[PDB]
Curated annotation (Swiss-Prot), chain A:
Entry annotated with the keyword Transport: no
Chain positions recorded as Zn(2+) binding sites: 8, 11, 25, 30
Superkingdom field: Bacteria
Taxonomic path: Bacteria, Thermotogati, Deinococcota, Deinococci, Thermales
Function: One of the primary rRNA binding proteins, it binds directly to 16S rRNA where it helps nucleate assembly of the body and platform of the 30S subunit. Binds mRNA in the 70S ribosome, positioning it for translation.
Name this protein carries in UniProt: Small ribosomal subunit protein uS4
Subunit annotation: Part of the 30S ribosomal subunit. Contacts protein S5. The interaction surface between S4 and S5 is involved in control of translational fidelity.
Keywords: Metal-binding, Ribonucleoprotein, Ribosomal protein, RNA-binding, rRNA-binding, Zinc
GO CC terms in record: small ribosomal subunit
The record's free-text note on cofactor binding: Binds 1 zinc ion per subunit. In a number of structures (e.g. 4Y4O, 5FDV) a 4Fe-4S cluster is seen in place of the zinc cofactor.
CDD domains named among the record's database cross-references: S4 (cd00165)
An individual GO BP term: translation
Boundaries of every S4 RNA-binding domain copy: 98-160
Gene: rpsD
GO molecular function, one term: metal ion binding
From Swiss-Prot, chain B:
Lineage of the organism: Bacteria, Thermotogati, Deinococcota, Deinococci, Thermales
UniProtKB keywords: Ribonucleoprotein, Ribosomal protein, RNA-binding, rRNA-binding
MF (Gene Ontology): rRNA binding; structural constituent of ribosome
Record PROSITE patterns: RIBOSOMAL_S17
SUPFAM superfamilies per the UniProt record, alphabetical: Nucleic acid-binding proteins
Gene label: rpsQ
InterPro entries: NA-bd_OB-fold (IPR012340), Ribosomal_uS17 (IPR000266), Ribosomal_uS17_bact/chlr (IPR019984), Ribosomal_uS17_CS (IPR019979)
One cellular-component annotation, GO: cytosolic small ribosomal subunit
UniProt name for this protein: Small ribosomal subunit protein uS17
Swiss-Prot record, chain C:
InterPro entries documented for this protein: Ribosomal_bS16 (IPR000307), Ribosomal_bS16_dom_sf (IPR023803)
Keyword vocabulary terms for this entry: Ribonucleoprotein, Ribosomal protein
Gene3D superfamilies noted in UniProt: 3.30.1320.10
Gene Ontology terms: cellular component: cytoplasm; small ribosomal subunit
Family, per entry: Belongs to the bacterial ribosomal protein bS16 family.
Pfam family, one: Ribosomal_S16
GO molecular function terms noted in the UniProt entry: structural constituent of ribosome
Domain of life: Bacteria
Subunit structure: Part of the 30S ribosomal subunit.
Source organism phylogeny: Bacteria, Thermotogati, Deinococcota, Deinococci, Thermales
Gene Ontology annotations of biological process type: translation
UniProt organism field: Thermus thermophilus (strain ATCC 27634 / DSM 579 / HB8)
Reported function: Binds to the lower part of the body of the 30S subunit, where it stabilizes two of its domains.
The protein's name: Small ribosomal subunit protein bS16
Amino acid sequence: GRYIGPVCRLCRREGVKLYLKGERCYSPKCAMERRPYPPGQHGQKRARRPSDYAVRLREKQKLRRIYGISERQFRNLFEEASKKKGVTGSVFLGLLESRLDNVVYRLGFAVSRRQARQLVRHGHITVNGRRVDLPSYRVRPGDEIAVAEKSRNLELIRQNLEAMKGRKVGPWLSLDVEGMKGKFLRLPDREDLALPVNEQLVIEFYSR
Amino acid sequence: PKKVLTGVVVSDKMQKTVTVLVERQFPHPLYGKVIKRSKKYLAHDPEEKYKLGDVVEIIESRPISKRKRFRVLRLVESGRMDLVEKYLIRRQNYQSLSKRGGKA
Amino acid sequence: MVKIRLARFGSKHNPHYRIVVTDARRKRDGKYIEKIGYYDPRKTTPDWLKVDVERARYWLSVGAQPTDTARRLLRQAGVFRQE
RNA sequence: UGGAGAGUUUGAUCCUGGCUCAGGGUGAACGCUGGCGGCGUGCCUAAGACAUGCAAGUCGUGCGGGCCGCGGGGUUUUACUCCGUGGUCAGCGGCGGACGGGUGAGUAACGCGUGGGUGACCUACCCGGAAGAGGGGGACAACCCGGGGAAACUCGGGCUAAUCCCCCAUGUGGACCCGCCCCUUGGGGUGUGUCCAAAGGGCUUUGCCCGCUUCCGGAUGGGCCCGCGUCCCAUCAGCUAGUUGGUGGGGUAAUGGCCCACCAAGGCGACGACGGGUAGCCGGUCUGAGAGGAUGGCCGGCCACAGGGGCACUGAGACACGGGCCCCACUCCUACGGGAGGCAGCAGUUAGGAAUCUUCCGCAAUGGGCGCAAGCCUGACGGAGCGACGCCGCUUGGAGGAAGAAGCCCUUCGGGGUGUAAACUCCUGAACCCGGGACGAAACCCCCGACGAGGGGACUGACGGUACCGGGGUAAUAGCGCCGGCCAACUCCGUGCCAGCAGCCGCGGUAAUACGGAGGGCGCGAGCGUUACCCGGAUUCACUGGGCGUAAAGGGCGUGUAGGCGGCCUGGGGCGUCCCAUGUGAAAG
Ligand SMILES: [Mg+2]
Ligand SMILES: [Mg+2]
Ligand SMILES: [Mg+2]
Ligand SMILES: [Mg+2]
Ligand SMILES: [Mg+2]
Ligand SMILES: [Mg+2]
Ligand SMILES: [Mg+2]
Ligand SMILES: [Mg+2]
Ligand SMILES: [Mg+2]
Ligand SMILES: [Mg+2]
Ligand SMILES: [Mg+2]
Ligand SMILES: [Mg+2]
Ligand SMILES: [Mg+2]
Ligand SMILES: [Mg+2]
Ligand SMILES: [Mg+2]
Ligand SMILES: [Mg+2]
Ligand SMILES: [Mg+2]
Ligand SMILES: [Mg+2]
Ligand SMILES: [Mg+2]
Ligand SMILES: [Mg+2]
Ligand SMILES: [Mg+2]
Ligand SMILES: [Mg+2]
Ligand SMILES: [Mg+2]
Ligand SMILES: [Mg+2]
Ligand SMILES: [Mg+2]
Ligand SMILES: [Mg+2]
Ligand SMILES: [Mg+2]
Ligand SMILES: [Mg+2]
Ligand SMILES: [Mg+2]
Ligand SMILES: [Mg+2]
Ligand SMILES: [Mg+2]
Ligand SMILES: [Mg+2]
Ligand SMILES: [Mg+2]
Ligand SMILES: [Mg+2]
Ligand SMILES: [Mg+2]
Ligand SMILES: [Mg+2]
Ligand SMILES: [Mg+2]
Ligand SMILES: [Mg+2]
Ligand SMILES: [Mg+2]
Ligand SMILES: [Mg+2]
Ligand SMILES: [Mg+2]
Ligand SMILES: [Mg+2]
Ligand SMILES: [Mg+2]
Ligand SMILES: [Mg+2]
Ligand SMILES: [Mg+2]
Ligand SMILES: [Mg+2]
Ligand SMILES: [Mg+2]
Ligand SMILES: [Mg+2]
Ligand SMILES: [Mg+2]
Ligand SMILES: [Mg+2]
Ligand SMILES: [Mg+2]
Ligand SMILES: [Mg+2]
Ligand SMILES: [Mg+2]
Ligand SMILES: [Mg+2]
Ligand SMILES: [Mg+2]
Ligand SMILES: [Mg+2]
Ligand SMILES: [Mg+2]
Ligand SMILES: [Mg+2]
Ligand SMILES: [Mg+2]
Ligand SMILES: [Mg+2]
Ligand SMILES: [Mg+2]
Ligand SMILES: [Mg+2]
Ligand SMILES: [Mg+2]
Ligand SMILES: [Mg+2]
Ligand SMILES: [Mg+2]
Ligand SMILES: [Mg+2]
Ligand SMILES: [Mg+2]
Ligand SMILES: [Mg+2]
Ligand SMILES: [Mg+2]
Ligand SMILES: [Mg+2]
Ligand SMILES: [Mg+2]
Ligand SMILES: [Zn+2]
């Protein structure tokens, strides 16, 4: 994926599990277990009252870190969203969620987003029956996201779709565990997501 | 359409030519207030038919000389040196504002 | 004299001509007198050639001389067809 | 649908007020770092100088020749001489060289923008329409002969063709003078008089094609004029005598002091003349809530310039970047007499500079010139090259993995941190290998058909064996800035007003979260910082949106000129103002 480096050290710094590793992020080993405090020599030091600014800086980091997106891309998406019609907060979340690499995570083909990102890159994914190896690729209502017919027998893809059997998926989505096909029914709504982020602080972060 | 302007004849001391002082009004591009700006046109008069104080219409014309690209169309109303006076005084007032002394 | 020719408007390796009426002396991509169509050589979309025969005919009737490729296209759209 | 503020003057406070930071932007440059690709973009300085190659030609269907062939005739044979055909060379003649490409030096201007005017005009080639091309004559190159020069080349003598020059004719028509009429600044008509046309060529030859002439018109391109708009200094206030106007003339496609002779005495200026500084203008671009500020690279339009200055010739068009003449500076050749040159075309060199690229591939595509066509020419252009210079996409892995290795590290010595990070397990599989392999190209052309409409056929790819598709396949670059406050991030040690930081506040004179290192941390990541510069915040020139008792700011007072401003009622006009319609507002953005 992106960033490349200790990931659980970010959950630590955000003091909120940003579930991004699949297993472990459930088992008593997410570091957020018996180690909730942030990383570094001063992790357990009595934290000082954060500054109005620090607060918005961390909220924007928590969000962007969840999708594993660069600030360059995050910002470009936010600006696009800003000028667009409709509550910038939701539209922004709507867009982040429309990234192919994300839709793959959402459909369970991958246990995490970094994995989903690698699956898309290595050509194991297909949009509308055509190979699309762009994590930033924007899915649109009606698109069918499937597993590449030649990758349908990958040891990883099996166990991952096996686990999706009986398992429910986002209301704005829908998948057929059999044909390993997914469907982007519609852009998710604020209420559809359960993100540990007050995106209002993010809009504010970009007006400073 | 050949521009038609209306002004006052301030100069007459010319052969087959009269000077027409034309004014115009317009809002200041930045400050709004309506301001009056003026301009003198040397208009053609083949018959030396117009004199000082004559308010005449001037029409855009084929060059008659350097400076002369307008001809006197018609007379709008005559005699009225009140208009010529402003010009004259304003002209004489130029004596005071300079480096040399002047009973302006 | 005035011509009916193609003006280049795509991008590198992505040519998209614009069938225009211009004086023979202008840059091929300079100021034309009128656009009367367009043409995508690679036919990337079903609509890779529009012409407006009406207009093509007005200019032809007043002098406009089309290049060879220009008429090839104008004809393909029935500018000269009289059936 | 659009507007965030912060630090810093005091012991403390409020205010005033400047400085400074957070944001965005750039033809960038510099430092450390640096993997792939697409698309853009790259001398901003000395408009300094330029080696070399290339950057405009093309027509044998306009003409006659020279040189080098091949072949056929006249003849009993030679000499001699006639014809046909191929190549080649320039010449005459024509169309193009006034476009395309470059640069912004100059210019503060009708230069540009915008809206209009031309009864004051032009427009090659293209399109439509009308009429026509009968006869005669001439010369100059080529070539041949001779002369002067080192060369550049130049002088003379002789011959010759034409779509070259001239004469006579026809006069559709058109031009001019005078008159009349309609219009009304030189528009249109008409009458007499005068004046003016032409070119030939080719065959799928006794017609058809290419072309010629005069005229009316179309289309396109352009000249000239006018209103309005277009930077700083008033420590620049007076300026002007071709100056301002008139008459006549010259000139031009055309108006005009455009130019000239003569006459008048004018014209311009504080609503900023003249003078000085700076500057190509615009569509737009950047910024800004907006108003506005700044700007004009790339692309598109206009202008201007082609070593500096002047000038005109030829042309439909030039006062002409790769045409001509002269003066000047300079380089070069020189037999010193005298000559040859001008990359602000592409590429490249050299100089200057903090700094800006390949002496590349192709004319396959689009566009241009010339040709009936074949086709030739196109450093326009289409492409590839170099540079993180900009934008976008992408990679350096994915999942599992200890209450947690080693080292480093802090330690109240018990532990704490780096760290699921690593190792390691498994999975995928950037690179790279093999295979296939494009779109961009269908026209011109030729056949059928009328050299038309329409139908049919063939040739043609620089990029490129590149994109893309399929098979195989390795875990496989990370950096830079920062952590006193503003401003997200703290500890040890070294140092001791030193060494040094420092955008502004300010740090350092022995326990320094501010120097240097280290661990750790924050931020961003193929980049990150720095310097410079523009807009913002800065209502810090305030039109929106500020002020002047004591903060900077009321003129020492008055009189009064221009100018600004102006009581109540009615009426006309309708300039300002408002409304409707309509035209314009190129494309790109
Ligand atoms: Mg595979
Ligand atoms: Mg702001
Ligand atoms: Mg302040
Ligand atoms: Mg004080
Ligand atoms: Mg203090
Ligand atoms: Mg380097
Ligand atoms: Mg490039
Ligand atoms: Mg330059
Ligand atoms: Mg040379
Ligand atoms: Mg060449
Ligand atoms: Mg023989
Ligand atoms: Mg020849
Ligand atoms: Mg040009
Ligand atoms: Mg000046
Ligand atoms: Mg002019
Ligand atoms: Mg006109
Ligand atoms: Mg015209
Ligand atoms: Mg004709
Ligand atoms: Mg003859
Ligand atoms: Mg001879
Ligand atoms: Mg000789
Ligand atoms: Mg002779
Ligand atoms: Mg003869
Ligand atoms: Mg005759
Ligand atoms: Mg006649
Ligand atoms: Mg008349
Ligand atoms: Mg007449
Ligand atoms: Mg007549
Ligand atoms: Mg013939
Ligand atoms: Mg005087
Ligand atoms: Mg005169
Ligand atoms: Mg004349
Ligand atoms: Mg005189
Ligand atoms: Mg001046
Ligand atoms: Mg300049
Ligand atoms: Mg804007
Ligand atoms: Mg403002
Ligand atoms: Mg603006
Ligand atoms: Mg502007
Ligand atoms: Mg430039
Ligand atoms: Mg341009
Ligand atoms: Mg011009
Ligand atoms: Mg030079
Ligand atoms: Mg001439
Ligand atoms: Mg040159
Ligand atoms: Mg140097
Ligand atoms: Mg070509
Ligand atoms: Mg061509
Ligand atoms: Mg891992
Ligand atoms: Mg060809
Ligand atoms: Mg036939
Ligand atoms: Mg055909
Ligand atoms: Mg690895
Ligand atoms: Mg600091
Ligand atoms: Mg802080
Ligand atoms: Mg020391
Ligand atoms: Mg110390
Ligand atoms: Mg101390
Ligand atoms: Mg420290
Ligand atoms: Mg301001
Ligand atoms: Mg104030
Ligand atoms: Mg005071
Ligand atoms: Mg007082
Ligand atoms: Mg005083
Ligand atoms: Mg009143
Ligand atoms: Mg008044
Ligand atoms: Mg009234
Ligand atoms: Mg009115
Ligand atoms: Mg209007
Ligand atoms: Mg319109
Ligand atoms: Mg537009
Ligand atoms: Zn976690």
